[PDB]
Amino acid sequence: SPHPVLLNLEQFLPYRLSVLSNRISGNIAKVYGDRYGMAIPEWRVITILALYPGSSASEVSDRTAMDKVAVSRAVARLLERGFIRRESMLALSPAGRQVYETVAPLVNEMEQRLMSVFSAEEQQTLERLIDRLAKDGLPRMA
Site residues (CB under 8 A) for its own copies?
3-10, 12-28, 30, 40, 44, 47-48, 50-51, 53, 63-67, 92, 97, 100-101, 104-105, 107-108, 110-111, 113-118, 122, 125-127, 129-130, 132-134, 136-138, 140-142
Separation between Cα atoms, residue 31 and residue 54, nearest integer Å: 26
Cβ(55)–Cβ(71) under 8 Å?
no
* CB of residue 119 to its own copies, shortest distance in Å: 11
* CB of residue 141 to its own copies, shortest distance in Å: 4
Alpha-carbon distances, residue 38 vs 22, 68, 102, 121, 123 (angstroms): 16, 18, 13, 35, 30
Separation between Cα atoms, residue 74 and residue 40, nearest integer Å: 9
* CB of residue 15 to its own copies, shortest distance in Å: 8
Separation between Cα atoms, residue 66 and residue 62, nearest integer Å: 7
* CB of residue 36 to its own copies, shortest distance in Å: 16
